[PDB]
C-alpha cells in the first residue's frame, strides 16, 4: 500500500475544500473533495455514452460516436438523442477535467511543492475548450465542435481542415507544429543525455553533470543546463498547445477563406508584385 519512503509524507492538511472529511487515500489514490467530484463527473459521463450506445444500437468502441447538435439548433439546447447527450457529456467532461486540476493542487499543498503541474494541465483544458466551446460559440453553433468517437473525430479533423483548403498554410499552425517537433527533439535529447551519464561505457564510473554540459558544448557549442532544459521542455510543450488553440480560435471566426491566400501580404507588395520571372510572376 505504501512506498518504502511514503509513510512520513501522508499527513493531514492541505485540502482546499471540505477540511478533513475527504482527506484520505484509497490505495495509492488520494481523494480530497475534488477526487469525489472527479469520480462523480466521470461516473455520470461514462453512463451517458452507454445510453448513447444503446440508442445507436452497437457496443463495439470503434463505431461508438456521440454527435453534437445539428447546425440548425444553433447554440440552444437539443434533445438527448439529437445532440443533447453530447452537451451534457461535454459539461461532465469539463467538470471532470477542472476537478482533476484542483485535486492536483491539493496534492501539491500537502507535499509542499510548486503548482506547476496543474498550471501546465490547464493549457490542455484550454485546448479542449477551444474546440468544444470557444470556437463553436463564436461561430454560433455547437455543431462545429468535434464528435466523441475514435474514428469520427478523426474525420472531423479531416473535414474541418480541408474546408479551408490546405490547413498547412495557417501561420499559427506552423508555429504550433514547430514547437511540437522541437519538443520531441528536446525530450529525446534530455532523456538520452541523463541516461548516457548515469549509464556510461562498460568499465567506466558514473559520469557527472559536468560531462553532460561538456557533451553538448562539444557537440553544438552550448548547453542550457539542468534547470534550463526543464524550463525549456515545459515552454515548448505549452507553446505547442497554446498556438494549437490559437490556430483554431482564429479560423472560421476572423478568417473564413483558404489559408493559401493568407501569404499575399508578402507576395503582392507594391514593390515587386509586378516584376516578371520567378514562380508567381
Amino acid at each position: 500500500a505504501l512506498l518504502s519512503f511514503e509513510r512520513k509524507y501522508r499527513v493531514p492538511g492541505g485540502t482546499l475544500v471540505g477540511g478533513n472529511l475527504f482527506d484520505f487515500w484509497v490505495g495509492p489514490f488520494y481523494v480530497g473533495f475534488f477526487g469525489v467530484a472527479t469520480f462523480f463527473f466521470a461516473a455520470l459521463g461514462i453512463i451517458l455514452i452507454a445510453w448513447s450506445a444503446v440508442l445507436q444500437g452497437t457496443w463495439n468502441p470503434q463505431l461508438i460516436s456521440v454527435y453534437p447538435p445539428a447546425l440548425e439548433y444553433g447554440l440552444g439546447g437539443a434533445p438527448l438523442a439529437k445532440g443533447g447527450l453530447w452537451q451534457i457529456i461535454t459539461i461532465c467532461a469539463t467538470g471532470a477535467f477542472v476537478s482533476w486540476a484542483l485535486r492536483e493542487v491539493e496534492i501539491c499543498r500537502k507535499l509542499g511543492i510548486g503548482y506547476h503541474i496543474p498550471f501546465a494541465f490547464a493549457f490542455a483544458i484550454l485546448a479542449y475548450l477551444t474546440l468544444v466551446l470557444f470556437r463553436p460559440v463564436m461561430m454560433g453553433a455547437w455543431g462545429y465542435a468535434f464528435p466523441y468517437g475514435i474514428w469520427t473525430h478523426l474525420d472531423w479533423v479531416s473535414n474541418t481542415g480541408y474546408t479551408y483548403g490546405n490547413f498547412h498554410y495557417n501561420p499559427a499552425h506552423m508555429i504550433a507544429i514547430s514547437f511540437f517537433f522541437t519538443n520531441a527533439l528536446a525530450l529525446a535529447l534530455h532523456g538520452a543525455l541523463v541516461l548516457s551519464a548515469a549509464n556510461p561505457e562498460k568499465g567506466k564510473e558514473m559520469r557527472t553533470p559536468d560531462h553532460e554540459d561538456t557533451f553538448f558544448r562539444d557537440l553544438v557549442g552550448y548547453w542550457i543546463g539542468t534547470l534550463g532544459i526543464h524550463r525549456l521542455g515545459l515552454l515548448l510543450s505549452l507553446s505547442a498547445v497554446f498556438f494549437s488553440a490559437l490556430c483554431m480560435i482564429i479560423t472560421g471566426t476572423i478568417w473564413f477563406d483558404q489559408w493559401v491566400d493568407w501569404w499575399q501580404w508578402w507576395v503582392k507588395l507594391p514593390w515587386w508584385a509586378n516584376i516578371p520571372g520567378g514562380i508567381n510572376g
Binding site: 512506498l3 507535499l111 525530450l187 529525446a188 548515469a198 561505457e201 558544448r217 534547470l227 520567378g278
Partner: protein
Amino acid sequence: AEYQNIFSQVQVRGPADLGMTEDVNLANRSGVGPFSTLLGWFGNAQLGPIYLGSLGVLSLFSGLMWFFTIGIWFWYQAGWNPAVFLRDLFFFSLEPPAPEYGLSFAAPLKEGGLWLIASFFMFVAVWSWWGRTYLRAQALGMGKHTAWAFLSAIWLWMVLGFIRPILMGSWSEAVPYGIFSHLDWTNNFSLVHGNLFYNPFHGLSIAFLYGSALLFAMHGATILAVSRFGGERELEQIADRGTAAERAALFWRWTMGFNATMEGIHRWAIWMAVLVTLTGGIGILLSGTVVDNWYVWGQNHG
C-alpha cells in the same frame, strides 16, 4: 507569485568552465565565447567552447554544399533578381527528377540533376554528424543513448528521401526542397494513399508526438515544482534519492495511482520521443509499396 522559477531573478558569473577533458582531443576545441545575459535569464550564459574533429569539419562543409546547391537553384528560378528572390523565397522548390528517369542518376541538372547532388551532400552531412554525436559520447566515456535516439530520426528521413523512393522505383517519390512545396507534397501524399488517418502506424506516431508534449510538460513542471529541493540535479538524485525525488514520485503516485523513479522517467522520455519517428518511418515505408489505400485497407482490417 512567491515562486516563478521560469526565469532566474539573479545572475551570477565566474571564470569560464573549460569542461571535462577525459579522452577528448583538446587541440580541436575552440576558445570560449562571450557570456550572454539574455540567455542567462533562462539557462547558462556561457557560449562555447565547441569541438570540431575530422567528422565535424566534414559535416559542416557537406552541409554548406547542400545549401548552395539549393541556394543557387532558388536564385536561378528567380531569374537572378534579388527582389523576386525574397518575394518568392517560400515558393521556390528544388524538385527530384521526373518519373521518366526512374532510378537513374542520368538526369540533367535543370531537370532533377541538381536535386540528386543536393541530396548527396545532405546525406554525407547528416551521417557524418551522426558519427560525431557518437564519437563525442565515446570520447567522454558516456553512453551512446544520444546516437541511437538520433538514429531513429535518421530512419524517418531515410525512408522519406531514400529507402521508399528506391522501393517504388522512382526518385520522383522523394521529397522536394522548398518551404511550401513539401507541405503540398505532404498533403498530396496523404490524398494519393487514400487518407493517411487510417494508417495505424500514423495514428501511433501521432499518439507518441502528443505523448511527448504530454510527458515533458508533466516532467518539466515536476522538476520546476521540486526545484525548491534541488530536484533538477537529477544525476545525484540517481546516486542518492533525495526528498526531491520522493515528493515528485508521491505526487504522481497519489494522482494516477502509480509513479516512476528519477532514472526510469528518462527511459520513459527517450522511448516516447524515439517512437515518434520510429513508428512513422514504418507507416510511410508500407504506403504505396504494400498498401495503396489505407481507408479501403482499413475497412477490411486485413
